[PDB]
Design a protein around this motif. Structure first.
Motif, PDB file in Angstrom:
ATOM      1  N   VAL A 147       0.924  -1.188  -0.077  1.00 33.95           N
ATOM      2  CA  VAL A 147       0.069  -0.054  -0.112  1.00 33.95           C
ATOM      3  C   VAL A 147       0.971   1.226   0.151  1.00 33.95           C
ATOM      4  CG1 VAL A 147      -1.896  -1.282   1.463  1.00 33.95           C
ATOM      5  CG2 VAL A 147      -0.319   0.472   2.523  1.00 33.95           C
ATOM      6  N   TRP A 148       0.147   2.527  -0.242  1.00 38.05           N
ATOM      7  CA  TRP A 148       0.898   3.424  -0.384  1.00 38.05           C
ATOM      8  C   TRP A 148       0.051   4.299   0.699  1.00 38.05           C
ATOM      9  CZ3 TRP A 148       1.107   0.603  -4.205  1.00 38.05           C
ATOM     10  CH2 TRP A 148       2.334   0.371  -5.097  1.00 38.05           C
ATOM     11  N   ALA A 149       0.580   4.505   2.021  1.00 39.14           N
ATOM     12  CA  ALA A 149       0.137   5.400   2.731  1.00 39.14           C
ATOM     13  C   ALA A 149       0.103   6.742   2.641  1.00 39.14           C
ATOM     14  CB  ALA A 149       0.977   5.297   4.357  1.00 39.14           C
ATOM     15  N   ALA A 150      -0.884   7.435   3.148  1.00 36.87           N
ATOM     16  CA  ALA A 150      -1.145   8.930   2.932  1.00 36.87           C
ATOM     17  C   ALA A 150      -1.648   9.641   4.070  1.00 36.87           C
ATOM     18  CB  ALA A 150      -2.152   9.214   2.009  1.00 36.87           C
ATOM     19  N   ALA A 151      -1.111  10.732   4.383  1.00 34.02           N
ATOM     20  CA  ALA A 151      -1.628  11.495   5.954  1.00 34.02           C
ATOM     21  C   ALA A 151      -1.613  12.929   5.341  1.00 34.02           C
ATOM     22  CB  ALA A 151      -0.426  11.305   7.055  1.00 34.02           C
ATOM     23  N   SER A 152      -2.648  13.561   6.071  1.00 33.98           N
ATOM     24  CA  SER A 152      -2.924  14.933   5.401  1.00 33.98           C
ATOM     25  C   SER A 152      -3.951  15.703   6.367  1.00 33.98           C
ATOM     26  CB  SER A 152      -3.451  14.754   4.033  1.00 33.98           C
ATOM     27  OG  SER A 152      -4.334  15.913   3.633  1.00 33.98           O
ATOM     28  N   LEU A 187       0.735  15.910   6.459  1.00 31.62           N
ATOM     29  CA  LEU A 187       1.286  15.824   7.938  1.00 31.62           C
ATOM     30  C   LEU A 187       2.509  15.035   7.334  1.00 31.62           C
ATOM     31  CD1 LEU A 187      -1.872  14.299   9.387  1.00 31.62           C
ATOM     32  CD2 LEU A 187      -0.761  16.693   9.467  1.00 31.62           C
ATOM     33  N   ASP A 188       3.705  15.373   8.192  1.00 38.78           N
ATOM     34  CA  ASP A 188       4.926  14.800   8.041  1.00 38.78           C
ATOM     35  C   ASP A 188       5.341  14.645   6.422  1.00 38.78           C
ATOM     36  OD1 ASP A 188       7.207  12.456   7.722  1.00 38.78           O
ATOM     37  OD2 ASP A 188       7.007  12.847   9.871  1.00 38.78           O
ATOM     38  N   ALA A 189       5.930  13.611   5.995  1.00 35.04           N
ATOM     39  CA  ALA A 189       6.067  13.839   4.484  1.00 35.04           C
ATOM     40  C   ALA A 189       4.794  13.562   3.591  1.00 35.04           C
ATOM     41  CB  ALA A 189       7.190  12.628   3.819  1.00 35.04           C
ATOM     42  N   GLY A 190       3.730  13.434   4.017  1.00 33.63           N
ATOM     43  CA  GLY A 190       2.586  12.943   3.641  1.00 33.63           C
ATOM     44  C   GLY A 190       2.086  11.697   2.799  1.00 33.63           C
ATOM     45  N   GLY A 212      -7.045  15.753  11.194  1.00 36.47           N
ATOM     46  CA  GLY A 212      -6.126  15.020  10.443  1.00 36.47           C
ATOM     47  C   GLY A 212      -6.595  13.479  10.016  1.00 36.47           C
ATOM     48  N   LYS A 213      -6.023  13.105   8.741  1.00 42.59           N
ATOM     49  CA  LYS A 213      -6.619  11.846   8.338  1.00 42.59           C
ATOM     50  C   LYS A 213      -5.407  10.974   7.947  1.00 42.59           C
ATOM     51  CE  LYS A 213     -10.904  13.476   6.661  1.00 42.59           C
ATOM     52  NZ  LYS A 213     -11.763  13.486   8.044  1.00 42.59           N
ATOM     53  N   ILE A 214      -5.399   9.552   7.987  1.00 40.96           N
ATOM     54  CA  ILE A 214      -4.570   8.787   7.451  1.00 40.96           C
ATOM     55  C   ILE A 214      -5.257   7.527   6.485  1.00 40.96           C
ATOM     56  CG2 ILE A 214      -2.908   6.733   8.252  1.00 40.96           C
ATOM     57  CD1 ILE A 214      -2.183   8.948  10.576  1.00 40.96           C
ATOM     58  N   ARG A 229      -3.550  16.867   0.011  1.00 40.52           N
ATOM     59  CA  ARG A 229      -5.151  16.860   0.374  1.00 40.52           C
ATOM     60  C   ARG A 229      -5.645  15.455   0.634  1.00 40.52           C
ATOM     61  NH1 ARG A 229      -4.886  22.580  -0.925  1.00 40.52           N
ATOM     62  NH2 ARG A 229      -7.207  22.354  -1.102  1.00 40.52           N
ATOM     63  N   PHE A 230      -7.033  15.628   0.734  1.00 40.10           N
ATOM     64  CA  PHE A 230      -7.600  14.214   0.935  1.00 40.10           C
ATOM     65  C   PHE A 230      -7.607  13.437  -0.011  1.00 40.10           C
ATOM     66  CE2 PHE A 230      -9.541  16.556   4.951  1.00 40.10           C
ATOM     67  CZ  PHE A 230      -8.607  16.370   5.757  1.00 40.10           C
ATOM     68  N   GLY A 231      -7.850  12.124  -0.056  1.00 46.60           N
ATOM     69  CA  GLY A 231      -7.887  11.028  -1.008  1.00 46.60           C
ATOM     70  C   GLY A 231      -9.318  10.812  -1.669  1.00 46.60           C
TER      71      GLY A 231
END
Length: 207
Positions: free
Chosen positions: A13-18, A24-27, A48-50, A79-81
């Motif tokens: 998977v490709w984690a995302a955080a925003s 958030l952090d490297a995103g 925040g969301k991950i 931004r959000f996915g």
């Protein structure tokens, strides 16, 4: 606050955080099966969301595309996915406390567990097989299970007016995952944690 993000799925998977208007952090980052990625989130992060993205292609500048959760074609999300996406949601240091939940309001793509790694609260989990049991009209051809708002765009599903109730579709998510938000005005399943807790988000927490 540190979040450890762990991929226990058998696929990459490709984690995302925003937080919607910033990374958030490297995103964002690739997590192969078994890998862990620790990020640092600024205290006071509100909204925040991950989440996880599946079946992605990025070129050498970090631009490309993801079959679920795409956040404007970027590896490093700001931004959000794009739904469908199971979401770990949190607001930190809000009058002394942290607030966490898992939401299915934007659909479901990957099972998830969201737990503190420090003392004084419980975690939440949405690990059922929602993709395999998805009602026919919510199935995303691209992979995953859409929420009904995304598919039908009506005031009742989107809770536009502030007055909605539960529907056949929100009840499907609620039956499979009682501890996640199934629609906007669902009875809250938010967990209150001590302010400045740390956390682990695990993708595919069970076998």
């Amino acid at each position: 606050a540190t979040f450890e993000i762990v991929n226990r799925c058998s696929y990459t998977v490709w984690a995302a955080a925003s937080k919607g208007d910033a990374a958030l952090d490297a995103g964002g980052r690739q997590l192969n099966s078994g890998e862990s990625w620790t990020i640092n989130v600024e205290p006071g992060t509100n909204g925040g969301k991950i989440w996880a993205r599946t079946d992605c292609y990025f070129d050498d500048s970090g631009s490309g595309i993801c079959k679920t959760g795409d956040c404007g074609g970027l590896l490093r999300c700001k931004r959000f996915g794009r739904p469908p996406t199971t979401l770990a949601e949190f607001s930190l240091n809000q009058y002394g406390k942290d607030y966490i939940d898992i939401s299915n309001i934007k659909g479901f793509n990957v099972p998830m567990d969201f737990s503190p790694t420090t003392r004084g609260c419980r975690g939440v989990r949405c690990a059922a097989d929602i993709v395999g049991q998805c009602p026919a009209k919510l199935k995303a051809p691209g992979g995953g299970c859409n929420d009904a708002c995304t598919v039908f765009q009506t005031s009742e599903y989107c809770c536009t007016t502030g007055k909605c109730g539960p529907t056949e579709y929100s009840r499907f998510f609620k039956r499979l995952c009682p501890d996640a938000f199934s629609y906007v005005l669902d009875k809250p399943t938010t967990v209150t944690c001590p302010g400045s807790s740390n956390y682990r988000v695990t993708f595919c927490p069970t076998a």
